[PDB]
Amino acid sequence: CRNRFVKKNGQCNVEFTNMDDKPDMFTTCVDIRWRYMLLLFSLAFLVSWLLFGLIFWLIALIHGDLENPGGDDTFKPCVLQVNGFVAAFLFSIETQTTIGYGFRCVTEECPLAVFMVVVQSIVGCIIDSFMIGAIMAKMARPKKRAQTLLFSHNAVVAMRDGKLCLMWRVGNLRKSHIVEAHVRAQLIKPRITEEGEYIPLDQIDIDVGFDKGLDRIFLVSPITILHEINEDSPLFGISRQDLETDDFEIVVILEGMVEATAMTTQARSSYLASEILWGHRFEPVLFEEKNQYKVDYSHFHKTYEVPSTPRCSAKDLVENKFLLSNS
Amino acid sequence: CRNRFVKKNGQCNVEFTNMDDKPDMFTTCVDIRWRYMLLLFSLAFLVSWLLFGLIFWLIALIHGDLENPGGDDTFKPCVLQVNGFVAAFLFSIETQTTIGYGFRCVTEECPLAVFMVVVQSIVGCIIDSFMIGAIMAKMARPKKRAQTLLFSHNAVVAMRDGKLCLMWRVGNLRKSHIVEAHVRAQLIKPRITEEGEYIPLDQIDIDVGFDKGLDRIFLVSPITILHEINEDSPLFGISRQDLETDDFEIVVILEGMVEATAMTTQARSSYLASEILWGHRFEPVLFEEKNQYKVDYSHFHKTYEVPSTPRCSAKDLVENKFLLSNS
Amino acid sequence: CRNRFVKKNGQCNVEFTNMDDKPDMFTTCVDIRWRYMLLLFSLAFLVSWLLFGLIFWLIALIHGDLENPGGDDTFKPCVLQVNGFVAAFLFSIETQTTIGYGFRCVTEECPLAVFMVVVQSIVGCIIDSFMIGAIMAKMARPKKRAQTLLFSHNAVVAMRDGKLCLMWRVGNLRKSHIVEAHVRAQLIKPRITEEGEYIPLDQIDIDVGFDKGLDRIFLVSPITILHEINEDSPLFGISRQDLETDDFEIVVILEGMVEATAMTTQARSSYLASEILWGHRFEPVLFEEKNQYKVDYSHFHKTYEVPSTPRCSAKDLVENKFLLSNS
Amino acid sequence: CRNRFVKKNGQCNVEFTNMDDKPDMFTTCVDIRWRYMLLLFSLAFLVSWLLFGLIFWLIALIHGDLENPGGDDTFKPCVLQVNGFVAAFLFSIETQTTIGYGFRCVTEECPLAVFMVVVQSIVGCIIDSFMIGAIMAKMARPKKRAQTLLFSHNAVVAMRDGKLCLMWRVGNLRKSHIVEAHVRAQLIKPRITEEGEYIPLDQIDIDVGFDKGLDRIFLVSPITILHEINEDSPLFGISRQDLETDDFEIVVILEGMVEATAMTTQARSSYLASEILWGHRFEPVLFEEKNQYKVDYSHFHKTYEVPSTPRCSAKDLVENKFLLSNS
Numbered sequence A, B, C, D: 001c002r003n004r005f006v007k008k009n010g011q012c013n014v015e016f017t018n019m020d021d022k023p024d025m026f027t028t029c030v031d032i033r034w035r036y037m038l039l040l041f042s043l044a045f046l047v048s049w050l051l052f053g054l055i056f057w058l059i060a061l062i063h064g065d066l067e068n069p070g071g072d073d074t075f076k077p078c079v080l081q082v083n084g085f086v087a088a089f090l091f092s093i094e095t096q097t098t099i100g101y102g103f104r105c106v107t108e109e110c111p112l113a114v115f116m117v118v119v120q121s122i123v124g125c126i127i128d129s130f131m132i133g134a135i136m137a138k139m140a141r142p143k144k145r146a147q148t149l150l151f152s153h154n155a156v157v158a159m160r161d162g163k164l165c166l167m168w169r170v171g172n173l174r175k176s177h178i179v180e181a182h183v184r185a186q187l188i189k190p191r192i193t194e195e196g197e198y199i200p201l202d203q204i205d206i207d208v209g210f211d212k213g214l215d216r217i218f219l220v221s222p223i224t225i226l227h228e229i230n231e232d233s234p235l236f237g238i239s240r241q242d243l244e245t246d247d248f249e250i251v252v253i254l255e256g257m258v259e260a261t262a263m264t265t266q267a268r269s270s271y272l273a274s275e276i277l278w279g280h281r282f283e284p285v286l287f288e289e290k291n292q293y294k295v296d297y298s299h300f301h302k303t304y305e306v307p308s309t310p311r312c313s314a315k316d317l318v319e320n321k322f323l324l325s326n327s
Ligand SMILES: [K+]
Pocket: A098, A099, A100, B098, B099, B100, C098, C099, C100, D098, D099, D100
């Protein structure tokens, strides 16, 4: 009903505007796209090859080498066979790439031309080294790492061991593991405090076992996360009828160090009130066979009805028992 | 008796099937094997060397260079000494590798041939830089890092300071340390909830001191991890006789940042009910000598009997004391 | 009034003096500046090019090559066309850069000159590889990573849900996320213990929800951090009048793994007593539009008065209620 | 009196013996020393240069090139100017280094020689790329990172705010910070359990505030860590007289992500019973000046006597107060 803060794929639906502007290289490197970075580097080569080509051409002109490029017994050029700009350009390329076919070749005659080969060589090494580093930076820090973690499409409400629970499923799409993996959840909705303060989107924890460490999971086969709805839950007063009427969002988070990518990851998804299925339970995916366990991921998102599920809130379930005792 | 979820070496015994298919480069790089990646790169060289060889050969043909490859006073080729495809191929290799022996050598005559050396040079740099990056990616992120952490073959049950305890041993195989190292444990077995829900493999925490921080260890010499079996333990009602009858698995985990590999690691092992030795204790490994401590790792896995160990459950041990008090 | 320990931008205002001096390469590499490192490497090239140039020149001299550099039917030089130091220098450059124009060229004659090309080649590879590594080290580990996290200029005191609270705002300047993000706060001031010990700057925790996990945040749009001022707070006895009189500093911290830079970050700021605005509340920044949320960052630092805010301390607010009950 | 488990500099004093032997490349790379790795790579160059030199020499021999190395109108060699092994060797070096002076130069004649240049080029790229990677691996993961964290030489016992405390000092030797920094401590000594089990070195936590988060520190200027000695402390029954008699070791740990090195670090030190100074307090190091704070690190390790410090244990201090109340 209201706008969705976090999309089902984890993407946050929030635009930032009217920010402040401040006056690093590593961040700049990984942002720019491939085709743009490769054009940039090929530009850096052209510019250096033209710059030095022009300088060697000038040196040829002033020395009189364009009139006698091969030299003779009386005359030795600065750089053999520089007879024009194209030849000067070729010698620059040949020097910096270090192809050096050698028909065009520097001589001992001109200390400036010697100096210029010394400088071009060093500039060449620098440009190359930066290209290798920029390529590794972008190679090592991509921005489209395909998600390795999966949330179910729906959450459910149902009874487990005498308690009304909100439940969602998480699974790992690879055979590699998640180290120090742990889960969180939040109820997102606006509210006004008793002092009349408006909070556009207040985020209220959904307890999944933090205080006894049980928020920490060892995720091999898909696990079902449990939030007991009790006094302290923000869903304590919500019945099945309140659900289809209500307008709120539950954000769910899984965090951990993913072996596959060697980086700490935050996977996300969202459940609107209208995506929570009261009186449902998830289809098992894990089955034992021969000498090995197996997970059929088709049943990952699938649920089934439990009609014996109470339709009243957890508060009502509690307050019924205290009355069914007095009289 | 039932299938083993996690093998003694940490390997999880679970196959994934019937997954969903989605439409990164860094993950692709580290997966592919050495011999396959090196063939792939040598293929990328061949392809680029043949591509450009063919292009330079075409340019020679159309220019009439194959009939006069050395040139003369009236005729200058695009690229000296390209007299066939093999020569064209050699010039391509020489240019991109930047060997450039120079017998075959580009001239000033043909702006397209000049352009093609410019392009081949840049393509060469790109291919090389990618090869360096791909080699480092795979070098820095291997998938056969020999385990540096060791679990004992067996767990044991025995008394320590008046309490019946489940115990397993962990040790570090190197002189380098594990930063922020800490342990976990779980009882793995299927169960049906009171509402008739089947959980194929429910994972139930085994308390090793999380709530007072004592799950955190400083692991120099092998340490023995302790799980007090009390009210809250899932082994509270299990006696020595129940053990040899029962069918369950205890997964044990050690996590931390390993100095040796500079990465957060999750070491794993498993104990089936039949691998837990009731009434046993581990052989010490740590002995003081001269001015230095020493660990003999032969006694790591070794145990010895304690016949004074009660054979009844922890519940029975408790319920006996309350009765031996009333009368 | 007293000196500020931590500046508003996070910078700590503390100088270290009279330290102890101890007798790594990776830290040395990232510290040195760009222009200084590039001069250092260009120096390393010059030195190696001159060293070997000199060695090849010596070999030429002793062999008699300077008198017959081209050689003939009876005489073969160690290295063709080394007719002086400049030629020797050029051959050294050409060999190590591997330009190798080849007019100057090593021969089969002198095993020492052959040995020296072998050594120079290897030295060349080593120098190059170090340059690539040093450039990546500095590229990957910069010291001017523009802050991606923002604190408000002021903290405020105001009522929320019946409780007097210290509040500051934190926001994320990028669309990328912060993994395992969490907050801390501290009151910094000197004190003397009852035993007469002076602590120049004692750091006293400001509780922002650590014991129930609520110090952990999922930071998409700017969040307001809450410190309930109660019995256990160090601001329990401080009223609005005490604030404008008092002299203390509150340091605020946000920590987490920042996706943008792939590194664990500690963002910092500070609030002097005189920067805390009693009886104020922050301007909302988050507004719903069309099918998307939006953050206007101009209102980030902006506040508004709440005159219904009590001006007495939290202790006074408490002690009033116990009296307004007895009589 | 007994052997010291952890040295004052953090080094653990434990040898491992009689370990099990198992049948990665990245770990192998960072272990080997510089001079040994550089010899290894220079060996890899020699071997490849000799291998291919020999192959090109064979090709010359069988083709009859050693009798006519320059060729003529009727005869074209496989590789020009290969007149012996030294020339063959030179051509191999020139090809793989890609110096390619070009006097020695491959021709179009022999498909095997062409094939061999193709193979040598690729082998060259591979060897080079591995050298760059191995150099970065060792560059990025050194084993002599100079410690950036300092512990005091002594711990002390003294009163703070009505409580008998064990105290040690920690300081940061750089202006860069430690992210998510936190402390631990342990009492190390052997003991026998009531069931007669010997634990060579039992490690018993020393509480420094874990349960309220106060083990976490923001370390700018040197901080003094506090362990309140109470009921739950293992130093509860230890008086000043017991200290000079006792034989135990307290290990102290500081962990966190160090900005300077971009890695999670564990700093260590130790205090033997004989290094704990009862009735002492640390010299302040932090002083306010002008508009800036300053730390004089000379007073870091320095202490001063407090003769008003009780000489009895914390148990005695407690049990005195309950008696001084009854009568
Ligand atoms: K070359």
